[PDB]
Design a protein around this nucleic acid. Structure first.
Ligand SMILES: Nc1ncnc2c1ncn2[C@@H]1O[C@H](COP(=O)(O)OP(=O)(O)OP(=O)(O)O)[C@@H](O)[C@H]1O
Ligand SMILES: Nc1ncnc2c1ncn2[C@@H]1O[C@H](COP(=O)(O)OP(=O)(O)OP(=O)(O)O)[C@@H](O)[C@H]1O
Ligand SMILES: Nc1ncnc2c1ncn2[C@@H]1O[C@H](COP(=O)(O)OP(=O)(O)OP(=O)(O)O)[C@@H](O)[C@H]1O
Ligand SMILES: Nc1ncnc2c1ncn2[C@@H]1O[C@H](COP(=O)(O)OP(=O)(O)OP(=O)(O)O)[C@@H](O)[C@H]1O
Ligand SMILES: Nc1ncnc2c1ncn2[C@@H]1O[C@H](COP(=O)(O)OP(=O)(O)OP(=O)(O)O)[C@@H](O)[C@H]1O
Lengths: 362, 362, 362, 362, 362
DNA sequence: TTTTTTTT
């Protein structure tokens, strides 16, 4: 009798697991009899309780194997290969669809009866977030389209505002929605090339709080970020491929992803501002501050930064046809649930409440 | 007949051996006759005497294997896998339960029939610790709670006071209770960027004495930390995930852990000052150090900076319900032992000798 | 038939051999017929003549094997594994008496009927040696106690003094007496990461003649060595475990060994002086030079370097009660032997020759 | 009927071969019929023609093997193992006694019937070398004795003086006589760690023309060598065992070899000067150049660089009693052979020609 | 049946195949039937068409193997091993004769009826080369004999001249003539250690265009070359075996080859100046320039750089007597071909054209 | 995995 390396490879695929120890550990759990498994009876972790019965017989014989890490390494290679194929063949449209489908799957758990989350608290987050900018959901939808099209030159958005104007909050939320990375170009010009290597194969990137010079008039400390950027023109426009470092390893060539730039109100050289479409800017607004102060479970649960919160806002506001055709079925049922759960006047209470700067969950 | 790899792996799981060499050495000890194993008869180490008879026959065959380290490598992977699994499938509350459970196991054996320390020495330790700062047990319990929740921004406590004021001393014990690491930022900014990654997968972190700049106002050596820290604000508040830098080494996207700052009395820009939940002051105390020299077994045995002394201190003050709900069983069992073995009056005598700074024992 | 890996492993354990090439060479000597072995006949090395007969058969078959280095690798692992086990489970006393026993055993040879060197020379060495300092025997008792008791922060000693003050010599004797290890420091801190690997599982370590800074006014060459060590405060203080590198292997984490450091009389930072129990001066008591120049066998034989000279010094001065109990009869036995070979007059005659800087003997 | 790994190992021992590729290359040559082997018939180099006919049988089957490099590695391991066992257990006198036996064997071939060079040209070279320094052969005898005794901190000789004074020349012949390695320390320290790795198990080292600083006043180009070397006091002193690198090898711990430093006359800091027991001040000597110009065969055959020449000098000059007793039988024959083949009057005539600066011969 | 590893090794041997990928690719070409092989039928490369039909069947079986890279590894190591053997066992003269066989083989193909070299153009090259310095043929012969003798500290020639004086041109031809490699010492001192690695087992080296300092007096850019090279003084002298390394290889110890240094008019330190046996001063010359314009087939076919051009010059100018006895017969045949093909007046007309600054042809 | 590169 023999271990089926195939069945392990299935488990790795179905779970999208790609750490050889994470895989090895979880498969070994299945050696004990599913018949009595506490995690199963407690319906505790889906990547366990969905699977324990299926894999039981193979996991038992795997537990005797003299070869365990070799099997897991071949299984891990299979999952990395799948990512590699997808990265080079898929449309950007499909990638976002995949990313969206995964978030909806995790929301099925969070707000399922087994789940711990409260949909009303998360919806309170959407109201506060929606209030942050006029026509927030149109801003979000425009931004998403822009990333999916990745049209050259028309690729980069600028976020301006004072400290605590929320730009870092929203950037993080978008980055959690789409997937991507942040970068810090305030560095001197030697470190920069290794720094930029981070972007390789990412869907999206973000430039955090760049520093100009002479803004210390406005008490904004000087730095070189702008002067670095104003010499990175060819990366921003995305019109032609560039070579990206990574430490020790060889250079690789691709188009530098689209992205977002964030700053306090330093002066922007006219050369650089031409690189941006659609400069958004942010004020402070005392009532949002007072509201957070009276509904701190938002922050304490990290709701306001979540990609899940943005997805909920899109479902609440956008027409179904705006979603990619595959997920439209899941979109319909989530609209259905949300319509069933919040009658609109509930949401009007929440919005009106935030406008009064009182605690959104009155 | 041939070695059971499974039995070796059970022993590794049961004894939580991380190290291939440590595993190999101990398992080879079992090859001699259990039926007169003198180490067992001397009841020296549980890791041997609790297992030798059970593992004996397999250990005999193990000695003749041509392949020994390969068996041990796979067994060690099994233990490391269990860590990685738990590290992604638990509440912070569960982790503390496990941490405390294990320490209590050590107290059980250490103060057992093997009786290898006098509890009173630790109680003098507890008494010394408790007199350091008002309601010292509450300080532990509330800082502890604070670290369990990891609520954003409500995350950093400042410890301040002169040289040799015990701030370093306290943290070392407390960090040993919980698990985590120290850090330094008295650094030109590059060297900050090579520290950061030691925080990876750390439950908690601590800043060693921060050199502020311009310290020579106190005649303190100036160093870089104060401005660096304000220029690190988000790592404090733990609002949004990041990835962190050792030299070279790996990271996985996570929030920067909560923590503690320790300080000789440099200034703070109220920007950085606003980042904190608490200030707590320190000094040497002169009767107390004249007690230490009169009480030196405390320091010889290091108990003064054992987290065990904190665990014991908590058990003396806090009520059973205030504890991890299953382990509450063990809590009463130890409260029974402690309250039986020690009246409040004997504690008051120690506490009084502590108060005099005379050697705690009389 | 086939090689027994067991018998090779026994030889490695029994010799406590440590290097895989050394073992391979050592064992292959046994392949020749025992009956005529010249090394056996003329009793040159215990490591050979004790064993050739016992291992001849297995050595003959070993000499043919196509796997010889693999066999030796497993054996070397077995010796290393025992070291690792003992490093955790033993008391610092138990370790120290193990060390002393091997010295006693060697002396049973070196003054046995073979007795390959003449105890008078060694005692003359011991004379020059105790004559180096006030209370030298008591000073070493204080040192040894300190190293067993292994207290944090109060953990290391400093030697200071001119070129040829002898400080390095005394360290080398204490290093051998304990069986510690020695570490360079005058290097960049990346390279350090693997030198420190030698400190894994050692009773003790030493650092040497560290290049200070600003020394040039005295011709004293400044260097990175001092400033590098400014960082390493936990390693010195022994406040918590640190992980250490080892090559083609796991890293491992433990408290860093206690130790000492020596210097010629550089500057010292006020922050680091804070972390040594004891600082010791050394001087050109030039008449000692005059003697040794004229007593050269002591130096040629490295007698005044030998840890044996200190073990002899200890056997002379200290009461058997001051020794660890288990060996105490061996102390009597050797004490008697020296009394049966010497008297305080004889020592004091030699002592006075050293005091006179005249050749030790008349 | 497969390859005998034993016979391959035996050949490697006989030849004293370390490089696995050199071993592989030479052993393959034996695959063809020795019966006609031109390298045999022309008796070209002895490491072939002595051994070919014996090994041919096994060399044929070796040539078909699929494991070839693996077999050669094990044989190379055996040679390296032998060097390490000898390094620990022989007296330094024995090492040199064995070394002299090898050179004497080569002199049997050099001046045999194969007779590739005549004894008079080397004896002319001896006269040239003895003319270089006052009491040359006495200096040779002193140096050997110093290296054999290996007295700690009295281990190093400094060769100093202007360019083309001959210090490189003299160092070269000693290095051949004793066997050892050259090292260059002028390179940056971070590279240097692996340079010293070559010194493992070596008898002797020579550091070549390290560069100082400040002698630019005379145009001596400045460099790092002195400062690098001054980090290495320990390695010079031989007081204590130190740790040595190799690529992909863990550190070896041993005492670092003694030997020679050459310099054009930069200044030596006191701390470094203190570590040289002797210094020799070479000087340019016009008539040598005019002799050399008319004695070209010396340089072409590299005669004055051979340890062979120094051995011939010692045999001409020293009492038989100074040689280690085992060799003295051979010394008698070489003394006889020399006195047979040369008058003293010829040697006197030669040294006169040298003294005149003329071509050595008339 | 099974792959014959011996036959692949024979192919590698007979093609001198140093690179494992190049070997693999070419051997796999043979798996198709030679009977139709277009590379054979169009006689495109001799290292294919000579061998295809012989190796065919073993190529077909090799094409199925699962070990293909391992077989190529073994074959390539024997090619490397044979060079390693030859490096030690040949005389420098006999090496040079082997190299001349190899160039003379290539010349049989080049100037063959097959192939395309019109020897008229190459003889024009000899004319232009013979103009560059007085007594050109004597200069080349003197260099060759110097390289054979390899006299210690008389090993290096220095080429000085204005930029554009043919100095790298002449070096290029010598390097091909002798075999050997070019090095760049102007690198930063860190990289330099791996640079010198390529010298291993090479016969000759050239240092291109070393920058001095202060030559900005002529607008020579300054750089490190001269400083670095004087740190390598030991390597030039060639008396003793230096240590060399390549990436991931442990060091090899050998005598560093002789060679040429090229530079513009920088000042050169006395120490480094003393290492050169001969200096040659190149200069711009208008007639060569004006000739070369009207003679550009020389440059377009690189005749002026080729070692083949120098060989033709030697064959023209030097007696049969000066070659070694093995090649002398083949030299006579080439002398016969040249004298038949040309005549003095034809050649003299070329030199006359060049000196007149005409195109070489009229 | 070390090593090389990074890091110095
Ligand atoms: N309208 C607002 N008025 C006042 N405070 C606000 C407002 N919106 C958000 N904040 C506060 O700002 C805090 C910090 O948010 P965030 O880091 O995203 O801002 P930011 O503008 O990007 O800041 P910075 O430039 O300092 O990084 C939030 O946690 C919230 O408490
Ligand atoms: N309150 C106290 N009473 C008695 N002794 C104390 C007290 N505080 C500290 N000391 C002594 O000083 C030692 C050093 O304490 P610690 O390193 O924690 O102080 P620190 O304030 O962090 O010092 P520094 O700022 O100088 O680094 C303690 O371990 C203890 O021996
Ligand atoms: N009292 C003394 N007077 C003179 N010389 C002494 C004295 N004590 C020791 N020495 C000499 O010191 C020499 C070297 O000893 P050692 O290396 O231990 O000294 P050190 O002070 O550590 O020197 P360094 O700092 O140079 O390494 C010995 O050979 C010995 O002869
Ligand atoms: N004392 C001398 N007088 C004259 N010529 C000498 C003398 N010694 C050496 N020579 C000549 O100088 C050449 C180089 O000698 P050598 O390399 O030994 O000198 P060095 O002083 O060590 O030089 P450097 O410091 O430059 O390396 C010898 O080959 C010989 O031709
Ligand atoms: N003496 C000369 N006078 C004028 N042009 C020449 C001369 N020699 C060669 N040239 C032409 O110009 C170039 C100059 O020579 P070369 O290419 O060898 O450059 P270099 O300046 O002498 O060398 P390097 O770049 O190594 O310092 C040649 O390639 C050739 O085309």
């Amino acid at each position: 009798k023999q271990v089926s390396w195939k069945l392990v490879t299935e488990y790795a695929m179905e779970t999208k697991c790609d750490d050889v120890l994470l895989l090895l550990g979880m498969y070994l759990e299945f050696q004990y009899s599913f018949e009595m498994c506490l995690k199963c009876i407690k319906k505790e972790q889906p990547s366990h309780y969905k699977y324990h019965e299926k894999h039981y017989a193979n996991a038992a014989i795997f537990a005797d194997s003299k070869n365990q890490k070799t099997i897991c390494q071949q299984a891990v290679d299979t999952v990395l290969a799948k990512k590699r194929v997808d990265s080079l063949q898929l449309t950007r449209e499909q990638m976002l669809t995949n990313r969206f489908n995964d978030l909806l799957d995790r929301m099925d758990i969070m707000f399922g009866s087994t789940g711990s989350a409260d949909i009303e608290e998360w919806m309170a987050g959407v109201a506060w977030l929606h209030c942050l900018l006029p026509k927030m959901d149109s801003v979000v939808y425009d931004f998403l389209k822009c990333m999916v099209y990745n049209i050259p030159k028309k690729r980069y958005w600028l976020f301006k505002g004072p400290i605590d104007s929320g730009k870092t909050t929203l950037a993080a939320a978008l980055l959690e929605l789409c997937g991507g990375k942040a970068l810090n170009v305030n560095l001197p010009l030697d470190r920069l090339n290794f720094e930029l290597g981070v972007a390789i194969d990412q869907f999206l990137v973000v430039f955090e709080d760049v520093k100009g010079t002479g803004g210390e008039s406005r008490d904004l400390p000087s730095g070189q970020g702008i002067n670095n950027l104003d010499n990175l023109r060819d990366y921003l426009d995305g019109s032609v491929k560039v070579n990206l470092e990574k430490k020790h390893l060889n250079k690789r060539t691709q188009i530098f992803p689209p992205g977002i730039v964030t700053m306090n109100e330093y002066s922007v050289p006219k050369t650089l501002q031409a690189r941006f479409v659609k400069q958004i800017d942010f004020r402070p607004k005392d009532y949002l501050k007072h509201c957070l102060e009276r509904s701190e479970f938002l922050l304490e649960k990290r709701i306001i930064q979540s990609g899940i919160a943005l997805l909920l806002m899109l479902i609440w506001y956008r027409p179904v046809a705006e979603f990619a055709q595959s997920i439209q079925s899941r979109i319909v049922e989530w609209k259905e649930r949300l319509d069933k759960e919040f009658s609109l006047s509930v949401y009007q209470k929440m919005k009106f409440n935030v406008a009064m700067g009182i605690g959104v969950l009155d």
